[PDB]
Amino acid sequence: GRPEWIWLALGTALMGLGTLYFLVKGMGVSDPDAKKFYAITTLVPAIAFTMYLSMLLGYGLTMVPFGGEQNPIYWARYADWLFTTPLLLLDLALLVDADQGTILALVGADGIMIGTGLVGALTKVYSYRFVWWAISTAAMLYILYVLFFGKAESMRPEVASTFKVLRNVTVVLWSAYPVVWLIGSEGAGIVPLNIETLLFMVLDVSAKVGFGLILLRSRAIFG
Amino acid sequence: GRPEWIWLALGTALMGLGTLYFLVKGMGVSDPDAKKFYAITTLVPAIAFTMYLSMLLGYGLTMVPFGGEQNPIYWARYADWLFTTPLLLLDLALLVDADQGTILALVGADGIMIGTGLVGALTKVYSYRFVWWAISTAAMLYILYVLFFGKAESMRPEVASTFKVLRNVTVVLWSAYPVVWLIGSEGAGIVPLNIETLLFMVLDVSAKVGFGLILLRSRAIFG
Amino acid sequence: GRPEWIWLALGTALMGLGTLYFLVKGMGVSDPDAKKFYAITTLVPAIAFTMYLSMLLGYGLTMVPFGGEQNPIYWARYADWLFTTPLLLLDLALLVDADQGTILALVGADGIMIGTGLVGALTKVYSYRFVWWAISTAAMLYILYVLFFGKAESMRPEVASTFKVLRNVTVVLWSAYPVVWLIGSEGAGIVPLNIETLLFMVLDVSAKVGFGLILLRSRAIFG
Numbered sequence: 001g002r003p004e005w006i007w008l009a010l011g012t013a014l015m016g017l018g019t020l021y022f023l024v025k026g027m028g029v030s031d032p033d034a035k036k037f038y039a040i041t042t043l044v045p046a047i048a049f050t051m052y053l054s055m056l057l058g059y060g061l062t063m064v065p066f067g068g069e070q071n072p073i074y075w076a077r078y079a080d081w082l083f084t085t086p087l088l089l090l091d092l093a094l095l096v097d098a099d100q101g102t103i104l105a106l107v108g109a110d111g112i113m114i115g116t117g118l119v120g121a122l123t124k125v126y127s128y129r130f131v132w133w134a135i136s137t138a139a140m141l142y143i144l145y146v147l148f149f150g151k152a153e154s155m156r157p158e159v160a161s162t163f164k165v166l167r168n169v170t171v172v173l174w175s176a177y178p179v180v181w182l183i184g185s186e187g188a189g190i191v192p193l194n195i196e197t198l199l200f201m202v203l204d205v206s207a208k209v210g211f212g213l214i215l216l217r218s219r220a221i222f223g
Numbered sequence: 224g225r226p227e228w229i230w231l232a233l234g235t236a237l238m239g240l241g242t243l244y245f246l247v248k249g250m251g252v253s254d255p256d257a258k259k260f261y262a263i264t265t266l267v268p269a270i271a272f273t274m275y276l277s278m279l280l281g282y283g284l285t286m287v288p289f290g291g292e293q294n295p296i297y298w299a300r301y302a303d304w305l306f307t308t309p310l311l312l313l314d315l316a317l318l319v320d321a322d323q324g325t326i327l328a329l330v331g332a333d334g335i336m337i338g339t340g341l342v343g344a345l346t347k348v349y350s351y352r353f354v355w356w357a358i359s360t361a362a363m364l365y366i367l368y369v370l371f372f373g374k375a376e377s378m379r380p381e382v383a384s385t386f387k388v389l390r391n392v393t394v395v396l397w398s399a400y401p402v403v404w405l406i407g408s409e410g411a412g413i414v415p416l417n418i419e420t421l422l423f424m425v426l427d428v429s430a431k432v433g434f435g436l437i438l439l440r441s442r443a444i445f446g
Numbered sequence: 447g448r449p450e451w452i453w454l455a456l457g458t459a460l461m462g463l464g465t466l467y468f469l470v471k472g473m474g475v476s477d478p479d480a481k482k483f484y485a486i487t488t489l490v491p492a493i494a495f496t497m498y499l500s501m502l503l504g505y506g507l508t509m510v511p512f513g514g515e516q517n518p519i520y521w522a523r524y525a526d527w528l529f530t531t532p533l534l535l536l537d538l539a540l541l542v543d544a545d546q547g548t549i550l551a552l553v554g555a556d557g558i559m560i561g562t563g564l565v566g567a568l569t570k571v572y573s574y575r576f577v578w579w580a581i582s583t584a585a586m587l588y589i590l591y592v593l594f595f596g597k598a599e600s601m602r603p604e605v606a607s608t609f610k611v612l613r614n615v616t617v618v619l620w621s622a623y624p625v626v627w628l629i630g631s632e633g634a635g636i637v638p639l640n641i642e643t644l645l646f647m648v649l650d651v652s653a654k655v656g657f658g659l660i661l662l663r664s665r666a667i668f669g
């Protein structure tokens with residue numbers, strides 16, 4: 001039906017397999033700290049799996065009028081990210097034993113990032129969609145700022161090493177989302193929805209399963 | 224108006240009385256641990272009370288097209304369960320001093336269970352509704368698994384005893400929900416909505432007020 | 447377009463400036479406890495900023511049929527309060543080192559207060575709107591009760607002093623909301639929407655930025 005269906009189907013399959021792999025791999029783990037990381041990390045692709053399935057079956061898709069056309073908007077992505085992005089930030093924060101204040105700042109700014117992105121995606125006045133994109137981007141920039149300038153002296157080498165790798169993976173991949181949104185169907189519409197869907201699938205799988213494989217294979221998750 | 228109104232009214236009344244009873248019973252409690260259990264346990268029927276009232280007044284009801292008919296779907300149940308089921312799991316987890324990793328696993332899987340159940344309840348393609356039911360059921364099975372195989376050596380007798388009772392009550396009652404959904408109006412439609420509503424009221428009151436009476440009368444909630 | 451636009455624009459500007467001020471003021475803070483208070487306190491007007499902008503641009507506004515008319519209902523307020531009121535209660539609770547049980551009681555009752563207020567705001571049967579208002583008010587009264595009768599012996603003077611001031615500010619300002627709602631467009635409609643919007647803007651800015659200035663200038667936030 002929809003040309004982007006193949007990418008949604010592949011996304012569903014990859015998130016599903018990733019979830020199952022992490023689920024199996026986490027069996028037997030008794031270390032409290034490691035359990036936290038496995039729980040957070042397995043839940044991420046499990047949620048993504050449900051939302052990709054939602055998009056594939058057509059439930060997480062809605063039509064938004066703007067620019068004089070009926071624009072297909074997959075709102076299920078925000079329902080996904082609303083829960084998965086904060087969880088991913090939690091993995092990074094727990095890894096460096098961040099204090100509660102910083103965790104709340106990250107989670108709250110993340111909520112603002114996704115919430116304003118959702119508002120922008122459903123906004124009927126074309127020009128306003130970009131106002132929301134700008135605010136969401138400012139929130140993302142705040143998050144990236146905190147990750148880099150927001151624990152070193154008393155920090156295990158493996159912890160510092162894995163955190164630096166996951167932080168770099170996060171900054172690169174997350175930074176791409178606003179660009180894809182901006183040039184894709186939710187924004188300027190210069191890149192067709194099918195290609196946009198492919199881009200998000202690669203980004204999502206990398207930011208979730210890729211990110212997860214790196215974290216769960218590290219000894220940093222253990223006390 | 225709607226034949227199932229009597230069960231919604233009785234459900235509203237029972238949840239309301241249960242809330243008031245727990246509220247009174249919890250007065251004077253100074254023990255920190257006991258306070259946690261009273262807060263969690265009183266909030267559960269208070270939330271259920273609001274959603275049952277929502278259904279009674281008709282606000283938590285919507286019409287979903289599928290199978291060639293306008294099907295009355297009480298979505299308010301998911302708004303209820305989304306918050307009450309995780310809270311109930313929290314009572315069980317705190318009772319056994321479960322570690323954060325396991326708590327997150329339970330809460331996250333519970334969110335998936337209710338979220339996919341909601342998607343299934345509102346899905347317009349009949350066959351797909353059952354795909355969502357299957358995923359939600361898999362999440363429930365994971366939860367039941369964790370409760371039984373997911374703390375013994377260093378565990379007070381009263382704690383182990385009450386937990387085992389509440390765990391058995393939980394497995395039996397919770398396991399009935401997917402069956403009721405499957406044969407009821409949201410699924411195969413072989414059992415009429417009025418009878419389905421009665422079933423859920425008995426299950427809800429038992430899983431909330433019944434469950435609550437057992438927990439709050441035990442000495443396990445005290446340090 | 448809408449006469450109340452000026453108050454929404456001023457509200458947007460004030461919440462935005464307040465957010466920026468708190469953001470700057472919180473720079474350099476290394477004290478863990480102080481970080482918690484700055485995070486919570488800065489997030490509050492940041493969220494309010496987004497929802498006021500939502501109302502200004504028209505996204506957070508919907509039409510609800512009741513009383514034989516199309517009533518303009520700004521639902522964005524509840525999306526705001528759903529997150530900001532619990533955060534404000536968290537500031538007060540952390541300030542007095544409240545135990546988890548009491549925190550959950552406050553947060554849960556707050557959720558009920560806002561959730562039932564939202565249901566009332568969107569209810570099509572006029573008389574029922576007031577039933578929801580009554581339940582929401584009962585939840586607010588419970589919260590006010592807990593704040594006054596729910597830690598003294600072992601409590602720093604500055605902490606007790608600032609808490610008492612913020613508690614008084616909270617009881618006075620919060621108590622006004624149900625009155626405004628009752629006499630405003632969501633209720634009896636005796637006070638026009640434009641005036642109602644002005645009232646909420648003054649209350650919101652005072653309960654958020656005013657409240658925030660008092661808290662963040664106190665030494666109580668430091669360990």
Ligand SMILES: *C/C=C(C)/C=C/C=C(C)/C=C/C1=C(C)CCCC1(C)C
Pocket residue numbers: 048081084085088113114117118132133134136137138140174175177178181204207208
């Ligand atoms: C599993 C998914 C991940 C890690 C998704 C990350 C999403 C973002 C960083 C999204 C950010 C956006 C903006 C900064 C601007 C507005 C549009 C968004 C929501 C695509």
Ligand SMILES: *C/C=C(C)/C=C/C=C(C)/C=C/C1=C(C)CCCC1(C)C
Pocket residue numbers: 271304307308311336337340341355356357359360361363397398400401404427430431
């Ligand atoms: C107070 C209510 C309780 C304890 C409700 C429990 C609800 C469930 C365990 C629901 C589970 C469902 C499935 C496993 C399959 C799909 C349909 C549901 C949501 C009814």
Ligand SMILES: *C/C=C(C)/C=C/C=C(C)/C=C/C1=C(C)CCCC1(C)C
Pocket residue numbers: 494527530531534559560563564578579580582583584586620621623624627650653654
């Ligand atoms: C930043 C906003 C604040 C501090 C808002 C406070 C909101 C309330 C205390 C609202 C309470 C209401 C009731 C008690 C009755 C029903 C209507 C409401 C939601 C306006």
